[PDB]
Design an enzyme around this catalytic site. Sequence first.
Site, PDB file in Angstrom:
ATOM      1  N   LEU A  79      -6.680  -7.301  -1.236  1.00  0.00           N
ATOM      2  CA  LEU A  79      -7.917  -6.612  -1.619  1.00  0.00           C
ATOM      3  C   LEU A  79      -7.742  -5.770  -2.879  1.00  0.00           C
ATOM      4  O   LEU A  79      -8.655  -5.715  -3.710  1.00  0.00           O
ATOM      5  CB  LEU A  79      -8.446  -5.754  -0.456  1.00  0.00           C
ATOM      6  CG  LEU A  79      -8.964  -6.517   0.758  1.00  0.00           C
ATOM      7  CD1 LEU A  79      -9.220  -5.579   1.910  1.00  0.00           C
ATOM      8  CD2 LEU A  79     -10.246  -7.298   0.435  1.00  0.00           C
ATOM      9  N   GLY A  80      -6.581  -5.135  -3.019  1.00  0.00           N
ATOM     10  CA  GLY A  80      -6.269  -4.300  -4.170  1.00  0.00           C
ATOM     11  C   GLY A  80      -4.898  -3.663  -4.102  1.00  0.00           C
ATOM     12  O   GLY A  80      -4.175  -3.816  -3.111  1.00  0.00           O
ATOM     13  N   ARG A  81      -4.521  -2.992  -5.185  1.00  0.00           N
ATOM     14  CA  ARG A  81      -3.259  -2.289  -5.328  1.00  0.00           C
ATOM     15  C   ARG A  81      -3.483  -1.041  -6.143  1.00  0.00           C
ATOM     16  O   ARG A  81      -4.197  -1.076  -7.145  1.00  0.00           O
ATOM     17  CB  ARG A  81      -2.199  -3.171  -6.003  1.00  0.00           C
ATOM     18  CG  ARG A  81      -0.777  -2.603  -5.836  1.00  0.00           C
ATOM     19  CD  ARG A  81       0.344  -3.566  -6.181  1.00  0.00           C
ATOM     20  NE  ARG A  81       0.317  -3.908  -7.596  1.00  0.00           N
ATOM     21  CZ  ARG A  81       0.577  -5.114  -8.086  1.00  0.00           C
ATOM     22  NH1 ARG A  81       0.936  -6.107  -7.277  1.00  0.00           N
ATOM     23  NH2 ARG A  81       0.478  -5.339  -9.385  1.00  0.00           N
ATOM     24  N   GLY A  82      -2.865   0.043  -5.702  1.00  0.00           N
ATOM     25  CA  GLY A  82      -2.867   1.323  -6.388  1.00  0.00           C
ATOM     26  C   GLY A  82      -1.440   1.704  -6.706  1.00  0.00           C
ATOM     27  O   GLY A  82      -0.528   0.880  -6.552  1.00  0.00           O
ATOM     28  N   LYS A  83      -1.217   2.962  -7.115  1.00  0.00           N
ATOM     29  CA  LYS A  83       0.152   3.367  -7.419  1.00  0.00           C
ATOM     30  C   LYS A  83       0.945   3.639  -6.171  1.00  0.00           C
ATOM     31  O   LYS A  83       2.162   3.762  -6.252  1.00  0.00           O
ATOM     32  CB  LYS A  83       0.204   4.564  -8.392  1.00  0.00           C
ATOM     33  CG  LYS A  83       0.527   4.147  -9.841  1.00  0.00           C
ATOM     34  CD  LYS A  83       1.011   5.316 -10.726  1.00  0.00           C
ATOM     35  CE  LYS A  83      -0.043   6.356 -11.073  1.00  0.00           C
ATOM     36  NZ  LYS A  83      -1.142   5.800 -11.911  1.00  0.00           N
ATOM     37  N   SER A  93       0.222   1.876  -2.881  1.00  0.00           N
ATOM     38  CA  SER A  93       0.132   0.844  -1.853  1.00  0.00           C
ATOM     39  C   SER A  93      -0.522  -0.425  -2.349  1.00  0.00           C
ATOM     40  O   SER A  93      -1.113  -0.455  -3.427  1.00  0.00           O
ATOM     41  CB  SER A  93      -0.665   1.374  -0.654  1.00  0.00           C
ATOM     42  OG  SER A  93      -2.021   1.616  -1.006  1.00  0.00           O
ATOM     43  N   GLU A  94      -0.386  -1.479  -1.552  1.00  0.00           N
ATOM     44  CA  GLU A  94      -1.051  -2.750  -1.750  1.00  0.00           C
ATOM     45  C   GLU A  94      -1.844  -2.953  -0.455  1.00  0.00           C
ATOM     46  O   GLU A  94      -1.321  -2.731   0.643  1.00  0.00           O
ATOM     47  CB  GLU A  94      -0.023  -3.862  -1.962  1.00  0.00           C
ATOM     48  CG  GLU A  94      -0.556  -5.020  -2.778  1.00  0.00           C
ATOM     49  CD  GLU A  94       0.522  -5.925  -3.353  1.00  0.00           C
ATOM     50  OE1 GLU A  94       1.478  -6.255  -2.615  1.00  0.00           O
ATOM     51  OE2 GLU A  94       0.389  -6.342  -4.526  1.00  0.00           O
ATOM     52  N   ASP A 153      -8.681  14.102  -0.972  1.00  0.00           N
ATOM     53  CA  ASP A 153      -8.996  12.994  -1.882  1.00  0.00           C
ATOM     54  C   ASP A 153     -10.341  12.417  -1.542  1.00  0.00           C
ATOM     55  O   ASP A 153     -10.517  11.192  -1.529  1.00  0.00           O
ATOM     56  CB  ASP A 153      -7.888  11.921  -1.899  1.00  0.00           C
ATOM     57  CG  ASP A 153      -7.902  11.017  -3.124  1.00  0.00           C
ATOM     58  OD1 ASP A 153      -8.498  11.418  -4.158  1.00  0.00           O
ATOM     59  OD2 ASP A 153      -7.299   9.910  -3.051  1.00  0.00           O
TER      60      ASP A 153
HETATM   61  N1  LIG Z   1     -15.975  -6.048   0.054  1.00  0.00           N
HETATM   62  C1  LIG Z   1     -14.717  -6.514   0.644  1.00  0.00           C
HETATM   63  C2  LIG Z   1     -13.837  -5.451   1.275  1.00  0.00           C
HETATM   64  C3  LIG Z   1     -13.401  -5.492   2.594  1.00  0.00           C
HETATM   65  C4  LIG Z   1     -12.616  -4.478   3.122  1.00  0.00           C
HETATM   66  C5  LIG Z   1     -12.251  -3.375   2.343  1.00  0.00           C
HETATM   67  C6  LIG Z   1     -11.453  -2.287   2.980  1.00  0.00           C
HETATM   68  C7  LIG Z   1     -10.303  -1.781   2.370  1.00  0.00           C
HETATM   69  C8  LIG Z   1      -9.580  -0.755   2.958  1.00  0.00           C
HETATM   70  C9  LIG Z   1      -9.977  -0.214   4.171  1.00  0.00           C
HETATM   71  C10 LIG Z   1     -11.114  -0.718   4.751  1.00  0.00           C
HETATM   72  F1  LIG Z   1     -11.568  -0.146   5.903  1.00  0.00           F
HETATM   73  C11 LIG Z   1     -11.852  -1.737   4.200  1.00  0.00           C
HETATM   74  C12 LIG Z   1     -12.699  -3.347   1.013  1.00  0.00           C
HETATM   75 CL1  LIG Z   1     -12.352  -1.993  -0.015  1.00  0.00          CL
HETATM   76  C13 LIG Z   1     -13.467  -4.368   0.486  1.00  0.00           C
HETATM   77  N1  LIG Z   2     -12.520  -4.202  -4.789  1.00  0.00           N
HETATM   78  C1  LIG Z   2     -12.828  -3.068  -5.651  1.00  0.00           C
HETATM   79  C2  LIG Z   2     -12.137  -1.767  -5.315  1.00  0.00           C
HETATM   80  C3  LIG Z   2     -10.952  -1.358  -5.913  1.00  0.00           C
HETATM   81  C4  LIG Z   2     -10.337  -0.168  -5.554  1.00  0.00           C
HETATM   82  C5  LIG Z   2     -10.896   0.662  -4.579  1.00  0.00           C
HETATM   83  C6  LIG Z   2     -10.178   1.929  -4.253  1.00  0.00           C
HETATM   84  C7  LIG Z   2      -9.717   2.771  -5.268  1.00  0.00           C
HETATM   85  C8  LIG Z   2      -9.052   3.952  -4.969  1.00  0.00           C
HETATM   86  C9  LIG Z   2      -8.829   4.322  -3.652  1.00  0.00           C
HETATM   87  C10 LIG Z   2      -9.281   3.481  -2.667  1.00  0.00           C
HETATM   88  F1  LIG Z   2      -9.071   3.829  -1.368  1.00  0.00           F
HETATM   89  C11 LIG Z   2      -9.941   2.302  -2.927  1.00  0.00           C
HETATM   90  C12 LIG Z   2     -12.104   0.238  -3.984  1.00  0.00           C
HETATM   91 CL1  LIG Z   2     -12.887   1.190  -2.763  1.00  0.00          CL
HETATM   92  C13 LIG Z   2     -12.710  -0.950  -4.346  1.00  0.00           C
HETATM   93  N1  LIG Z   3       4.849  -7.343   1.014  1.00  0.00           N
HETATM   94  C1  LIG Z   3       4.251  -7.430  -0.296  1.00  0.00           C
HETATM   95  C2  LIG Z   3       4.803  -6.380  -1.173  1.00  0.00           C
HETATM   96  C3  LIG Z   3       6.022  -6.508  -1.824  1.00  0.00           C
HETATM   97  C4  LIG Z   3       6.592  -5.439  -2.496  1.00  0.00           C
HETATM   98  C5  LIG Z   3       5.958  -4.192  -2.531  1.00  0.00           C
HETATM   99  C6  LIG Z   3       6.662  -3.099  -3.261  1.00  0.00           C
HETATM  100  C7  LIG Z   3       7.968  -2.740  -2.916  1.00  0.00           C
HETATM  101  C8  LIG Z   3       8.701  -1.867  -3.706  1.00  0.00           C
HETATM  102  C9  LIG Z   3       8.139  -1.306  -4.844  1.00  0.00           C
HETATM  103  C10 LIG Z   3       6.841  -1.640  -5.146  1.00  0.00           C
HETATM  104  F1  LIG Z   3       6.266  -1.079  -6.243  1.00  0.00           F
HETATM  105  C11 LIG Z   3       6.091  -2.518  -4.397  1.00  0.00           C
HETATM  106  C12 LIG Z   3       4.716  -4.079  -1.870  1.00  0.00           C
HETATM  107 CL1  LIG Z   3       3.881  -2.561  -1.760  1.00  0.00          CL
HETATM  108  C13 LIG Z   3       4.143  -5.157  -1.224  1.00  0.00           C
END
Ligand SMILES: NCc1ccc(-c2cccc(F)c2)c(Cl)c1
Ligand SMILES: NCc1ccc(-c2cccc(F)c2)c(Cl)c1
Ligand SMILES: NCc1ccc(-c2cccc(F)c2)c(Cl)c1
Length: 327
Positions: free
Chosen positions: A43-47, A49-50, A154
């Site tokens: 779904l996404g990646r930040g600094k 988590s993925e 946050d």
């Molecule tokens: N529009 C597709 C989609 C589906 C799920 C999520 C999502 C991500 C993290 C936690 C969560 F409760 C739901 C997002 Cl951001 C986008």
């Molecule tokens: N798929 C678009 C998207 C990308 C990132 C995020 C996002 C950014 C920062 C924190 C977080 F919990 C989620 C969302 Cl909500 C939607």
């Molecule tokens: N399992 C997919 C995956 C693989 C590697 C990482 C990872 C591990 C170490 C450092 C980093 F920046 C990212 C993440 Cl978060 C998810």
Amino acid sequence: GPVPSRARVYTDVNTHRPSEYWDYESHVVEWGNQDDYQLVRKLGRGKYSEVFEAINITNNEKVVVKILKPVAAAKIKREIKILENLRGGPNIITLADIVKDPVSRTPALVFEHVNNTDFKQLYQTLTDYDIRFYMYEILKALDYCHSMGIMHRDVKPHNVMIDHEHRKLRLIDWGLAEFYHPGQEYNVRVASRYFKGPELLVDYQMYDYSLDMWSLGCMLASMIFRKEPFFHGHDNYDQLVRIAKVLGTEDLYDYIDKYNIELDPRFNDILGRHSRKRWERFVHSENQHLVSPEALDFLDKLLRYDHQSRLTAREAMEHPYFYTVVK
Ligand SMILES: NCc1ccc(-c2cccc(F)c2)c(Cl)c1
Ligand SMILES: NCc1ccc(-c2cccc(F)c2)c(Cl)c1
Ligand SMILES: NCc1ccc(-c2cccc(F)c2)c(Cl)c1
Ligand SMILES: NCc1ccc(-c2cccc(F)c2)c(Cl)c1
Ligand SMILES: NCc1ccc(-c2cccc(F)c2)c(Cl)c1
Ligand SMILES: NCc1ccc(-c2cccc(F)c2)c(Cl)c1
């Protein structure tokens, strides 16, 4: 030096609860089975988590898996403890499991799935009633977590998941959340720029739950005025000048004088002198349908420099702006 400050509510929650409650470093993580989950899409990646959409193959339910990065990995216990402490709370994301990801070699948090509606789509279609309704749901989550001795730190639209079809809301990403202990000095590098409270911007470290109430007010102003973000700072310094162009510099100086805070001298060349503006200044033909005297009065009581003066989440729920919301 700076005058000390204490929350006016839920001050001593963490002292009267047992040590096992807030001492997150002493918490032993219970590990689940990584084999129960099948990652489906990233779904996404930040600094920190993925995040993935996944399927729990032991019950065919959709879940969300947050694979923590090592920087976040060091402080996972605080996030895990907070999530376990808050589990079952109203509108709080439910942590379902904790597993060890075999590839990342880091913990992966598994959450209930929320079918999140796109931010742009929702921002553009919310009616006056839907704004009030979802603001009330966010307040339930914030009063619950503050009552449990935790500040989110946050609050911002990306951390509020909304499944608009089922009118379901969840407050997510407790990675910056912290336990409130009266008199403790916290890191001011929390919250996203546009949602940072003035206490962070002036480097006042003895803040509390009321930081979340500033952030909530920034979200409300953006939605009712159709101005995203409401306080559009270029950096953290300009962020304060943007606030001061609305609330005024005299109330800013009253705030810093009350707490014996000195502004960074770099503000001398950028802050200037600004009167307090009336909230009606931001009303126009394209946002009038989202504004009311109750909305403006409520916003006025959130967006206050003095963190001790802001409405608490429970007082906010008592406000006339929510009288129209079916309860
Ligand atoms: N529009 C597709 C989609 C589906 C799920 C999520 C999502 C991500 C993290 C936690 C969560 F409760 C739901 C997002 Cl951001 C986008
Ligand atoms: N798929 C678009 C998207 C990308 C990132 C995020 C996002 C950014 C920062 C924190 C977080 F919990 C989620 C969302 Cl909500 C939607
Ligand atoms: N399992 C997919 C995956 C693989 C590697 C990482 C990872 C591990 C170490 C450092 C980093 F920046 C990212 C993440 Cl978060 C998810
Ligand atoms: N993550 C999408 C998202 C989250 C929250 C909100 C929101 C913010 C303030 C008040 C409100 F009634 C709703 C919107 Cl518009 C979109
Ligand atoms: N910024 C000028 C402005 C423009 C219009 C309004 C307005 C809009 C709808 C109904 C109403 F009684 C007044 C206000 Cl309060 C301020
Ligand atoms: N939804 C139409 C609308 C919009 C704005 C206002 C308004 C006007 C002046 C001050 C104020 F606090 C609010 C009213 Cl009365 C109705």
